[PDB]
């Protein structure tokens, strides 16, 4: 997958490398990112990778802790993650599987509307399935694009194989090309 890298870089790596462009053209910096695609398939693999190249602090949050479901601490836990991230600026906050309760959603929207971009602190929240809630989150000041993760193509799946193929040995003629085409539509 290649298109994912560019748009995430333009929305995360770019706001990290050249803040002068957004002040020179007088814009509020982009604030949020949201990922559509099958669960995983480079979803976390992308977010973890971009944080390394920007060297900002990465925050990993599962969808499970998001849905404590007995009014656990959703009201304030969101803030506690946010404040610590500001303390370690620049930082990247990542959450996964938003599809996995309404009150803390409103809480997150208010924080998303309220926190300042003065610290290169951004939110990348990821999803697996096409949900009715997901289309409602795409709002001003919260998220700015719709990165898509398609199932890997034939040559694409071959590259995935080659990524883990370095360690593995081989016979006198292992053609990964022919192996690649045997799984149409398989995920990453």
């Amino acid at each position: 997958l290649d298109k994912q890298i560019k748009e995430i870089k333009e929305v995360i790596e770019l706001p990290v490398k050249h803040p002068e462009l957004f002040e020179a053209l007088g814009i509020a910096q982009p604030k949020g990112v949201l990922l559509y695609g099958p669960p995983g398939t480079g979803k976390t693999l992308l977010a973890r990778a971009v944080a390394h190249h920007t060297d900002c602090t990465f925050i990993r949050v599962s969808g499970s802790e998001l849905v404590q479901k007995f009014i656990g601490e959703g009201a304030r836990m969101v803030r506690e993650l946010f404040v610590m991230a500001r303390e370690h600026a620049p930082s990247i906050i990542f959450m996964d599987e938003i599809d996995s309760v309404q009150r803390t959603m409103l809480e997150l929207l208010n924080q998303l509307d309220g926190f300042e971009a003065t610290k290169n602190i951004k939110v990348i929240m990821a999803t697996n399935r096409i949900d009715i809630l997901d289309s409602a989150l795409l709002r001003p000041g919260r998220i700015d694009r719709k990165i898509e993760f398609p199932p890997p193509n034939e040559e694409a799946r071959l590259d995935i194989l080659k990524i883990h193929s370095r360690k593995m040995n081989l016979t006198r003629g292992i053609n990964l090309r022919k192996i690649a085409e045997l799984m149409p539509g398989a995920s990453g």
Partner: protein, 404 residues
Amino acid sequence: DKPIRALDEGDIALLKTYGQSTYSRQIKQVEDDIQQLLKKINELTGIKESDTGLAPPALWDLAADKQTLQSEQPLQVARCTKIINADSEDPKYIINVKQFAKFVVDLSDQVAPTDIEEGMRVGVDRNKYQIHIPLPPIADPTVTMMQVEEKPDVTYSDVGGCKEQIEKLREVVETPLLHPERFVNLGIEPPKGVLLFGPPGTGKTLCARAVANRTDACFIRVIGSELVQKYVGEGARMVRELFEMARTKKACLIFFDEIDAIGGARFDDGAGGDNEVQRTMLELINQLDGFDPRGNIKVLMATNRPDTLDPALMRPGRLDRKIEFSLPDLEGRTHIFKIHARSMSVERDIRFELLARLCPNSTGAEIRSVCTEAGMFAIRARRKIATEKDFLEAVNKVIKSYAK
């Protein structure tokens, strides 16, 4: 359209500059230099002294400070327990230096054994832990500010239309403490518990504040939500020192406001729920009327849902007298308008009765708000006197805006 990609690092250098070349480099250098020079100034100035400070110099030090420092004993706090009294000459005392240890100690020769009871929260010396001084029992902190410690600026004159209500309330709460001689000579025991109930905004809390002002004795305010605590049994414990603190006073008033918060009737079909609150409410019931008679602790109780209260708490003996508050009538509305408008800057020519009969069943709080809004109407014109017109327009605004 035509597909495109993001910016190139080679592009960005000129693209950020290109058109903007007039003052951009200079302005940026000035900005960053300003920032770093400010950081310099902050450093060269040094750390801003976080010194808390002391009292102003003219008052303090003296040789007496060093004197008491060198002379006085650094006494340690502890809890006494179970006087031995085996030989009754030196009866021996077991104390608990809380967080530290437990000990068997004696008294200093200054303090008499009759001055020590069991527990007693006694402080001891640091070397041999002799009993050196008795200390007041530790009232729980959050219970302490619950004491009002100040009289609100309201008298019974402010309360209007509730004349029989305040009459019975003074009969039950103020009369026995001011004039105990009437009851005993006749030979009756006055009531000790009052429940005030009515619609929201009827003026119950106003009578509460009026009583607290005219009390002249110790008065403690309670809001029903305060006793709710997340720890189990903490609310009941809190009620316990709340009552014991009151007993320490020479007669005292206790005021719960909206006891509905915890006073809910006991229920079981939920297999759980608010039973933790119910335990606190049971402790309260036990405190008002049970073993160990309450003493001269009159209890004032106000709530919007008298129906919802548990019958056991609702029982007379704990709540001896029920006082009903109703929406003011035309006479009551005129009286309350007279009350609030008196302090306001108006012409002494307004037809208060016209305003009142123009007023529907609107509560007393509505009267206060309408008077304030008339004052606001006057202020918006910067008229240093209010007008009757302002009162009317406030009536339309408030009453009809809600009645829309």
